[PDB]
Amino acid sequence: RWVQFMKEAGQGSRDMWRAYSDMKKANWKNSDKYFHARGNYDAARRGPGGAWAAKVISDAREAVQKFTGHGAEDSRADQFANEWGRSGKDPNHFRPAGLPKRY
Amino acid sequence: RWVQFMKEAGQGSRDMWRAYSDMKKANWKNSDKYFHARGNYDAARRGPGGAWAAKVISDAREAVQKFTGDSRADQFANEWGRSGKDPNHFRPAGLPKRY
Amino acid sequence: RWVQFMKEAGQGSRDMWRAYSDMKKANWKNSDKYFHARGNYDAARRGPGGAWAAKVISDAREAVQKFTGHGAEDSRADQFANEWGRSGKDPNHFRPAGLPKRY
């Protein structure tokens, strides 16, 4: 169903929001790739709709970041982490040392 | 606040699925437009985040209709409810009162 | 903000819908790529939100139409036209002989 896909998309959107919210609450140096990967990883594991939402949201954020002057290298690196998580690879490969266990 | 907007969007999305779910359970003829209006109505009542979510979901639905090959009529109902107007405008005869 | 982005996305979405509509009513064979390119071209000109919406819509169209028998050979060809217009190239490159000035 389109309904089931959309439900997955809604949940994946929530996952993406949580990664952003946790990133902000954590204030941890060089943690953004971890949180980029984690949100995409969580969302894609909701199902196809979740993977779709993760991609659509990732792509919008990359666009807004570019507009603000984010460098091409940093954007590419962020997109690498996004796709890493979304494909099911462990977000913890981007985990900075000492990031609290709750994240 | 973004947290509040997201909260409403979450609520509104749940209102939309509940409307589609009730539509399936009711299995009542000529009831589709009622449930489209009702989901959008309930969702918009949650706040701006709910109206946004309701529009996203309604628009995504029309996209699937267009892509696969009535849409306009559904959107009339979607917008009627989301605008705060009475979903019962579309209520078919017989529909159980809990819906 | 994201306010401007979403404004552009709405503009871009309307451009895409208008291309799909024009495609339906023109009923011109071998004109598919023209309208796909044109929708994406018009949408990308709205700015980043428009380009983003155009890609979201284009990709969703490809994925959804798989359920109505559109295979990869034609769908990837549509997608070549989508990216063509989106990148700023002339949709008219795909214009079939005689298509009315209205489109």
* Residue A19 structural domain: 1-103
C-alpha span between A49 and A45 (Å, rounded):
9
Q: Under a CB-based contact definition with an 8 Å cutoff, are residues C28 and C96 in contact?
A: yes
Give the whole-angstrom CA distance, residue C36 versus residue C50: 14
Method of determination used here: X-ray
Domain count, chain C: 1
Q: Cα torsion for C62, C66, C70, C72, to the nearest 10°?
A: 70
Chain A residues within 8 A of C61 when measuring between CB atoms: none
Whether A7 and B17 lie within 8 Å, measured CB to CB: yes
- Entry field: residues in chain A: 103
Contact partners for chain C, using 3 or more CB pairs closer than 8 A, are: A, B
C39: its two tokens: 């929708």
Nearest to B68 among C20, C57, C64 (CB): C64
In this structure, how many other beta carbons lie within 10 angstroms of the beta carbon of residue B18? 15
∠ CA C73-C77-C80, rounded to 5°: 145
> C23 — contact with chain A (CB < 8 Å)?
no
- Cα A65 from chain centroid? 14
Subunits with at least 3 CB pairs below 8 A relative to chain A?
B, C
- CB of C16 closer than 8 Å to CB of C39: yes
Q: DSSP label at C89?
A: -
Cα A62 to its chain centre, rounded Å, is 11
Say yes or no for a CB contact (<8 Å) between B10 and A14. yes
